[PDB]
């Protein structure tokens, strides 16, 4: 496995950011997922040596943190809040609309690998319930029409 120049540079920046190299693990793993659309298992070894940590330490971190996905590859991750306020305000309507638009359910990835619905806990935007993320972007769900319009910005 070989990291691309563009990602290696960003990873190195994170590693030199904090006083201790090992502190950059989460930021490095966020950057890896942003580039690939997942955490490739093969990328865990060059990352381990980059932070000066054992491979099993990095593996444990990926497994502990919910945002890091070691299994499925997806260009866009639709994090749909399934917590109390969004549930009470319309999580299932948003889930129904996403199913009508993409033809996929939570934990499923579209055949072309473009989108993946990810059920997550409180997104901290409860006043705007039901809430959903499309990678870093966060929105309030209004309707299927409003959703289809938002989702068309992702290609």
């Amino acid at each position: 496995f070989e990291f691309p120049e563009e990602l290696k540079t960003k990873l190195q920046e994170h590693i030199n950011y904090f006083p201790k190299k090992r502190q950059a693990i989460l930021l490095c793993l966020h950057e890896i997922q942003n580039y690939y659309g997942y955490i490739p298992p093969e990328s865990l070894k060059p990352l381990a040596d980059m932070l000066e940590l054992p491979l099993n330490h990095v593996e444990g971190v990926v497994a502990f943190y919910d945002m890091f996905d070691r299994e499925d590859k997806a260009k866009y991750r639709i994090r749909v809040c399934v917590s109390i306020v969004c549930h009470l305000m319309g999580t299932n309507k948003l889930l129904k609309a996403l199913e009508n638009i993409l033809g996929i359910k939570p934990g499923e990835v579209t055949p072309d690998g473009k989108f993946k619905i990810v059920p997550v806990q409180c997104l901290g935007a409860c006043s705007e319930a039901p809430v959903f993320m499309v990678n870093d972007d966060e929105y309030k769900f209004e309707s299927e029409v409003q959703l289809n319009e938002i989702l068309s910005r992702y290609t």
């Binding site: 693990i25 966020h30 971190v61 109390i84 009470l88 006043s127």
Partner: protein, 416 residues
Amino acid sequence: SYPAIPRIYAETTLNMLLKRAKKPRVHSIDEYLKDGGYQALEKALNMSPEEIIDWVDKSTLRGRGGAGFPTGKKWKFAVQNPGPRYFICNADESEPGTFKDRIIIERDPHLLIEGIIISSYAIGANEAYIYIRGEYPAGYYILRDAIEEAKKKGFLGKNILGSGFDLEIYVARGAGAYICGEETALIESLEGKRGHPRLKPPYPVQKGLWGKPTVVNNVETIANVPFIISMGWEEYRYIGPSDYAGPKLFPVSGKVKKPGVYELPMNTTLREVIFKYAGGTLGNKKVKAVFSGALDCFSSEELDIPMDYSPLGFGGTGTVIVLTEEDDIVEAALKIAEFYEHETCGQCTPCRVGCYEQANLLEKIYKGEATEQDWEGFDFVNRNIQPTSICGLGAVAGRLIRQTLEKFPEEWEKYR
């Protein structure tokens, strides 16, 4: 340019923490300075760190991160131990219904940054951190840009405002675990390990980051520091008037006409928050319950309680999740149950199995698939998540659900 942020409604009667944060936009350092920003930092750097701790202690400012610990007292504890010392801003905010902290981060980062600088100076910390949850990417980028603005104006970096004081603020990102909001788990995450809380004692104020005296304060608590120093401790305790000083942010959500963040004094009642400020309920339906995040449950007979930290007060993080007539308490309790099932770090067995069984038994109860044993087991499990727990999650994972079983027995009886 920053990633898309939801347009969270914000309102204030005090115009302090939300003086700029009431507008949904990133306020630059120029807009912050225009309002008299960084004048408190200038005043603080001419004082001794001891004087600043005394003003914070005298102001009677209490932690806004749930525990309500007096901020001044916490700082006094850390300074009784030799340095180097560390200051950490807790921007993990992951409790359901809580969204008050992000609007300070995303709209007025300089209010938070100045607060961090003053607080770091007060405890002699030359290294500070902002631990921001991973689900706030925009907040992360906004804070990085704002930190660069502060350095470029001489409020951060080396020899800040010619005082000789050096400070670096590092922004760390969380990656999806509510438990990383717990101060010891947060430190573990910052050290690059899994967010597993450590057994207390030791306490972070004596042994925190790298085993050094560490002060962990919530975003909202830190945002109060520039006001304490700018106004003075006296003016600050007079605002309310309540025995629990200062402005307070109330993230109001649920079946209210106007959900959002409300900056109100803590003497304000729960009824006032819902009806006077949030604009009542949708269709004017009767409020059956109010969930204080995922911590407490208040019935319609507890609406006249104050929003302070008194024994009969609202307490917690001031999180208001409104539930009307049409909302099923069992269905709500299930969402609370599901939250603890998903967030237990699994270090403690009664918490690991307790949070799991509570959610799984509640789902069976809710679906009409529960036996008499599943019912009797649900009661047992709810009462036995606390044993051997080494952090606050285990102690409270059954609290709200127990309150619904006690305050809404008629609703549960339908399912039994």
